[PDB]
């Protein structure tokens, strides 16, 4: 537009990236979420409270598929979320055009991490305020990855981001464990999302997606209401 193109993200006198720290604080101001890998597939749980009774929960979805076997949720701000959602949507399809093969999630988080780290340095932008959880079932062992505004990427067994992630972190330190089943991950995931919720949790509050090894399937409020019935 002008060619100003100077990076407003600079180093501190201590040596700390300041905008990445403040962006991680903006991650900490976001909605809580937790995701657990257990021995056949990966269950992602998010926590969506509409600010009024006027609202519609049928419109906006948080668990958003990327392929027919790859899901992706966040903990941060939605308007910065959907941009790299769409960037991952376009980005997987060049892999499906070149190699003619379902893209591995390991390759996704490499490339999306390259986009985000490459975006922290470019001409005059703030970084994204989004911390992603990316799941999927490739080659027989289901994966769960987490990215962040620093462009880094981790490989967690069962983590949690958003509000009270040290509370859900210590809760997922002991209560999460060696190996479960697909339904057994849902129980402890709804419990650890029931760590920091309000006085009621319905089919409109939570929204839970899974990855089978045979393929992705986002769940419906019928079973989302049936499992949390059965408080966790």
């Amino acid at each position: 537009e002008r060619g100003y193109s100077f990076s407003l993200t600079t180093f501190s006198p201590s040596g700390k990236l300041v905008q990445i720290e403040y962006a991680l604080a903006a991650v900490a101001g976001g909605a809580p979420s937790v995701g657990i890998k257990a021995a056949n597939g990966v269950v992602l749980a998010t926590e969506k409270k509409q600010k009024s009774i006027l609202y519609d929960e049928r419109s906006v979805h948080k668990v958003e598929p990327i392929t027919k076997h790859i899901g992706l949720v966040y903990s941060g701000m939605g308007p910065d979320y959907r941009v790299l959602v769409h960037r991952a949507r376009k980005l997987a399809q060049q892999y499906y055009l070149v190699y003619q093969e379902p893209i591995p999630t390991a390759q996704l988080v490499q490339r999306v991490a390259s986009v985000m780290q490459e975006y922290t340095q470019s001409g005059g932008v703030r970084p994204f305020g989004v911390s992603l959880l990316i799941c999927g079932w490739n080659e027989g062992r289901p994966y769960l990855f987490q990215s962040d505004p620093s462009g880094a990427y981790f490989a967690w067994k069962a983590t949690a981001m958003g509000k009270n992630y040290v509370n859900g972190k210590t809760f997922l330190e002991k209560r999460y464990n060696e190996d479960l089943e697909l339904e057994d991950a849902i129980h402890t995931a709804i419990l650890t999302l029931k760590e920091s919720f309000e006085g009621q949790m319905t089919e409109d509050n939570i929204e839970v997606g899974i990855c089978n090894e045979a393929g992705f399937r986002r769940l419906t409020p019928t079973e989302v209401k049936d499992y949390l019935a059965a408080i966790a």
Binding site: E1, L8, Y55, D80, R82, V125, R126
Partner: protein, 240 residues
């Protein structure tokens, strides 16, 4: 809180904020307008008003009811220039949907498009974030009428009955008191709530030359702005 230039451009505060968007959320409030959208069973009603401070200004130009396509209407709040500059991008992207994909655009996707362009206005640091507030209605296959709202923060957003602008912090509190009940929604029930929800706010109970009502209804799904005579028919039809 503040550190550096965070009170000036769209970069982060130490607390996690970004002040330019939360200035844009009260960039709407200079307009002086209440606008309420109500989704009925088979219909949806936009209600607005106008201010005519001169006798020399027209009644034919100041209508905020802008038509996007022949199945999609919209109404605008916030400041005027950002509102109209949003409209040609809405019309233009609707027309490119018609050229590229060959079928009529759902009202859902246009708010994702406008929300993403408003994100690109927010994301890049050297361009103003367009302090207008976008409100849509429309008809979809087997999904009834729909209402959506696009704030200048970049999220597509749409509910059962929503209103943003100046006075709407209490208007949403009235619509919570009016929606959650055992009442259904007929046509004149939706129109008769669309006036009275606003007349509870302003407490004026005024002439039918002030509120502009655009409506859509699945008998004839084309967006339609009511004539003043049938507006008067509703407005004295509510007076028992």
């Amino acid at each position: 809180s503040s550190a550096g230039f965070d009170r000036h451009i769209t970069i982060f505060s130490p607390e996690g904020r970004l002040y330019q968007v939360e200035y844009a959320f009260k960039a709407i409030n200079q307009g002086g307008l209440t606008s309420v959208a109500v989704r009925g069973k088979d219909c949806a009603v936009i209600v607005t008003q106008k201010k005519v401070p001169d006798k020399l200004l027209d009644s034919s130009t100041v209508t905020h009811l802008f038509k996007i396509t022949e199945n999609i209407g919209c109404v605008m709040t916030g400041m005027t220039a950002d509102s109209r500059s949003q409209v040609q991008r809405a019309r233009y992207e609707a027309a490119n949907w018609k050229y590229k994909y060959g079928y009529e655009i759902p009202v859902d996707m246009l708010c994702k498009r406008i929300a993403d362009i408003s994100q690109v206005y927010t994301q890049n640091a050297e361009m103003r974030p367009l302090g207008c507030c976008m409100i849509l209605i429309g008809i979809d296959e087997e999904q009834g009428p729909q209402v959506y709202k696009c704030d200048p923060a970049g999220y597509y957003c749409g509910f059962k009955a929503t209103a943003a602008g100046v006075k709407q912090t209490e208007s949403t509190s009235f619509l919570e008191k009016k929606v959650k009940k055992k009442f259904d929604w007929t046509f004149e029930q939706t129109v008769e709530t669309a006036i009275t929800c606003l007349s509870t706010v302003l407490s004026i109970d005024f002439k039918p030359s002030e509120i502009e009502v655009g409506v859509v209804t699945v008998e004839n799904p084309k967006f339609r702005i009511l004539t003043e005579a049938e507006i008067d028919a509703h407005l004295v039809a509510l007076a028992e």
